[PDB]
Amino acid sequence: SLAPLRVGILGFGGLGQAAARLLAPKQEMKLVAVADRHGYLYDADGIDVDNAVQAYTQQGSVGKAKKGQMSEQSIEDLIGEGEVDGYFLALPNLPNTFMADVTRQFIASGWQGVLVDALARTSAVEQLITLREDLAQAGITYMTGCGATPGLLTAAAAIASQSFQEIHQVKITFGVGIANWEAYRATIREDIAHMPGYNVDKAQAMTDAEVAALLDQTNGILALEDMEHADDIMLELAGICHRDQVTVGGVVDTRNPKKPLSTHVKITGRTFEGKISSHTFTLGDETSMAANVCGPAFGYLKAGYGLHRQGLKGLFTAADVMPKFVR
Amino acid sequence: SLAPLRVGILGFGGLGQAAARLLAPKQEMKLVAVADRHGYLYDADGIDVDNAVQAYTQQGSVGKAKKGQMSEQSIEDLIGEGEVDGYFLALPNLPNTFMADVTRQFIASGWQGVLVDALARTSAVEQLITLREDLAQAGITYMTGCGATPGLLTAAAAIASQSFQEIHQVKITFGVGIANWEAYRATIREDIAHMPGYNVDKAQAMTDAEVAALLDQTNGILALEDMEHADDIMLELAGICHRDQVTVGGVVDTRNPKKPLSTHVKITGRTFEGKISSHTFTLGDETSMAANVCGPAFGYLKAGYGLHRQGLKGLFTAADVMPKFVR
Ligand SMILES: NC(=O)c1ccc[n+]([C@@H]2O[C@H](COP(=O)([O-])OP(=O)(O)OC[C@H]3O[C@@H](n4cnc5c(N)ncnc54)[C@H](O)[C@@H]3O)[C@@H](O)[C@H]2O)c1
Ligand SMILES: NC(=O)c1ccc[n+]([C@@H]2O[C@H](COP(=O)([O-])OP(=O)(O)OC[C@H]3O[C@@H](n4cnc5c(N)ncnc54)[C@H](O)[C@@H]3O)[C@@H](O)[C@H]2O)c1
Ligand SMILES: C[C@@H](N)[C@H](CCCCCC(=O)O)CC(=O)O
Ligand SMILES: C[C@@H](N)[C@H](CCCCCC(=O)O)CC(=O)O
Numbered sequence: 192s193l194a195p196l197r198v199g200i201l202g203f204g205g206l207g208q209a210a211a212r213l214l215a216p217k218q219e220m221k222l223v224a225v226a227d228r229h230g231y232l233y234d235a236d237g238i239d240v241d242n243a244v245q246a247y248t249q250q251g252s253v254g255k256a257k258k259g260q261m262s263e264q265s266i267e268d269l270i271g272e273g274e275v276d277g278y279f280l281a282l283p284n285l286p287n288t289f290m291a292d293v294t295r296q297f298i299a300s301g302w303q304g305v306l307v308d309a310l311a312r313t314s315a316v317e318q319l320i321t322l323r324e325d326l327a328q329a330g331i332t333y334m335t336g337c338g339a340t341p342g343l344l345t346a347a348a349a350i351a352s353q354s355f356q357e358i359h360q361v362k363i364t365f366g367v368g369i370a371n372w373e374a375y376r377a378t379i380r381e382d383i384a385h386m387p388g389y390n391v392d393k394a395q396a397m398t399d400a401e402v403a404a405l406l407d408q409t410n411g412i413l414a415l416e417d418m419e420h421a422d423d424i425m426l427e428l429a430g431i432c433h434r435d436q437v438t439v440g441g442v443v444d445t446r447n448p449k450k451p452l453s454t455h456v457k458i459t460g461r462t463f464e465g466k467i468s469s470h471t472f473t474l475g476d477e478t479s480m481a482a483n484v485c486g487p488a489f490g491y492l493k494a495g496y497g498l499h500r501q502g503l504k505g506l507f508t509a510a511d512v513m514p515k516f517v518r
Numbered sequence: 519s520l521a522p523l524r525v526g527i528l529g530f531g532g533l534g535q536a537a538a539r540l541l542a543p544k545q546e547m548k549l550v551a552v553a554d555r556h557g558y559l560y561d562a563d564g565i566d567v568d569n570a571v572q573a574y575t576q577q578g579s580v581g582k583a584k585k586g587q588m589s590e591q592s593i594e595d596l597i598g599e600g601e602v603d604g605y606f607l608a609l610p611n612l613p614n615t616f617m618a619d620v621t622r623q624f625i626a627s628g629w630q631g632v633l634v635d636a637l638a639r640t641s642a643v644e645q646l647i648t649l650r651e652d653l654a655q656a657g658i659t660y661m662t663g664c665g666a667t668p669g670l671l672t673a674a675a676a677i678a679s680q681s682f683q684e685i686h687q688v689k690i691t692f693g694v695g696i697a698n699w700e701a702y703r704a705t706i707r708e709d710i711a712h713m714p715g716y717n718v719d720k721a722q723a724m725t726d727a728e729v730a731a732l733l734d735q736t737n738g739i740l741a742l743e744d745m746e747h748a749d750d751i752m753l754e755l756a757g758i759c760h761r762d763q764v765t766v767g768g769v770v771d772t773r774n775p776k777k778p779l780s781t782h783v784k785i786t787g788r789t790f791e792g793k794i795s796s797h798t799f800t801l802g803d804e805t806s807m808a809a810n811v812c813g814p815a816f817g818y819l820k821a822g823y824g825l826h827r828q829g830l831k832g833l834f835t836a837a838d839v840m841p842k843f844v845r
Contacts, residue, residue: 347678353817429843462813464539464809466804466806468802472678478681485790487681510840516679
């Protein structure tokens with residue numbers, strides 16, 4: 192509260208906006224920086240969040256806000272100008288290489304500090320693994336898969352694993368309730384890509400009408416099984432189990448602000464007594480996706496600052512570190 | 519497996535013996551050292567666990583084993599002789615000052631490395647807090663409350679808290695099934711002290727007959743509510759909630775190797791959207807107390823080594839650190 196972390200959000204959609212509302216009441220963390228595709232907003236006194244959302248929703252960028260600046264290289268521009276201790280990357284991974292590219296920008300920028308993502312795909316995370324040395328060398332502490340899943344649920348699994356001699360499966364079943372699907376376009380596009388008939392490239396090309404059409408077949412309900420989720424590699428990287436033992440599935444109701452099922456992770460293992468058993472970590476039906484994603488993200492930004500401060504640089508997952516409650 | 523942690527166990531009761539069985543199949547960790555009240559056993563090739571248990575059970579000390587040495591200052595002696603990277607303190611906290619005293623021994627010993635306890639009482643932990651600077655200065659990384667509760671459940675709570683703006687309660691309800699109460703004498707004596715009619719001093723003085731008599735009133739079933747559990751201060755120390763928001767209760771069936779209820783922690787908070795909700799982390803009914811205690815203990819020894827290695831010394835709780843799966 193005397194020396195507060197100055198933090199930025201890149202991307203101002205469902206997650207970016209929700210991140211900004213979540214940081215509003217904090218005293219240890221101050222939102223100084225937001226960027227979207229076409230513009231950015233910096234204010235070392237703290238972002239008027241209501242104004243940044245008004246600007247974004249009605250004029251299509253935060254660059255159109257009281258303090259905003261338009262730019263077709265918003266993040267590139269914001270990096271040089273902004274005195275910022277850590278950024279949350281609330282961005283799409285469209286294409287599957289985009290997060291890595293922005294991270295490359297940050298590496299080349301010379302900039303030092305903490306980065307956090309809520310990256311979902313094993314493949315997207317592997318691209319970030321590509322950069323783990325570069326990351327260390329540029330003096331960046333990078334916290335990857337630090338949302339809900341990956342993130343909170345992965346970390347719960349890493350903690351639960353401690354009871355066992357060998358891990359057998361980590362099963363994630365998530366439920367999401369959103370009032371309409373446009374609230375989290377990329378989240379829902381990235382979901383449709385996981386589906387049987389589809390991929391990343393197809394999902395990207397699809398029109399808002401084609402998405403509503405698909406959704407309409409099932410009354411707004413995406414059932415997703417064995418999705419390509421980075422929970423798998425993070426748990427492997429922590430040496431808890433092989434990625435093949437990690438399985439991620441769920442149900443998105445896109446016409447319903449209420450969760451269609453209780454999000455839970457089941458951790459199955461054999462104890463040193465040769466008994467086989469399962470721990471269950473279940474989320475409260477009234478913890479929203481945004482809460483379950485952005486809450487851990489900033490806890491991981493803080494833990495990441497902890498690590499940065501004792502000169503720890505490189506790539507950490509939600510599985511590797513205890514996030515620190517942000518006040 | 520090339521460079522394995524050499525670890526010791528102080529105390530060879532229910533937990534100490536179970537610790538030794540748990541470390542048997544590990545390749546990253548080698549049991550080199552065990553101490554009980556009257557003797558100790560060192561063997562830098564690894565303890566024959568079956569022999570140490572035979573010696574203890576039938577001749578009353580591990581000092582009576584193939585390699586053993588009798589001593590009425592077993593731990594004092596074992597410290598000087600033993601090349602050991604980390605110790606698990608499987609000891610009673612009778613009297614409520616005993617853990618602190620042994621820790622003082624370790625401080626005065628000059629010895630460097632990692633210590634772990636499964637300490638249960640807020641008061642016992644406060645005594646260890648007394649020593650946090652001494653601990654740092656002697657070059658010891660000390661992991662306190664790193665069993666089941668405190669420990670695993672506390673850590674699960676710290677992770678679950680991340681979804682929330684404010685924490686309202688952490689409620690722990692534990693179930694324990696043991697075939698007879700003498701398996702974990704001090705555990706059960708420490709329990710009876712928490713009870714309404716009793717205290718530490720009374721519990722200590724009580725005879726094995728007086729304990730069986732008490733237990734016999736309720737057919738071997740201790741119901742315990744609002745116990746003085748260090749979960750409370752650890753969560754406060756991690757700045758997640760005030761100790762008064764943390765509440766620990768449970769049921770020990772002392773005539774039943776099956777859990778009388780499913781151990782769980784409920785974490786209640788308000789999200790940034792002003793919604794109030796609860797996460798639940800439940801343990802599998804076939805994870806034993808020993809598994810749920812010793813598994814996290816050694817995960818925390820390893821994490822503690824991690825911290826020691828980057829020159830981090832002092833007092834950490836299960837709430838402050840991600841334990842590392844031991845292989
Ligand atoms: N880990 C988890 O638990 C978790 C959960 C949900 C979503 N996610 C992921 O989080 C990401 C964000 O999803 P969302 O629903 O907030 O997305 P969204 O489509 O609602 O918003 C994307 C935002 O990115 C902005 N942006 C900023 N700079 C950009 C640039 N240079 N190019 C393109 N867009 C730019 C856009 O303007 C837009 O505001 C997705 O990839 C999603 O899969 C992770
Ligand atoms: N954190 C948790 O989840 C958790 C759970 C269960 C028990 N515990 C705690 O763990 C502790 C161990 O309980 P237990 O059931 O293994 O105890 P126990 O009574 O079965 O064994 C105690 C052992 O301490 C040994 N010991 C070694 N050196 C000693 C010395 N100098 N003085 C006295 N005894 C000495 C005794 O010889 C004996 O082997 C208790 O304090 C208990 O409350 C914690
Ligand atoms: C966007 C959804 N399809 C997933 C939701 C994970 C968060 C939900 C957990 C909860 O709040 O219960 C996350 C993802 O897919 O990356
Ligand atoms: C000994 C008992 N009275 C408690 C049991 C905590 C571990 C049980 C959790 C479980 O395995 O379900 C621990 C304690 O009291 O310190």
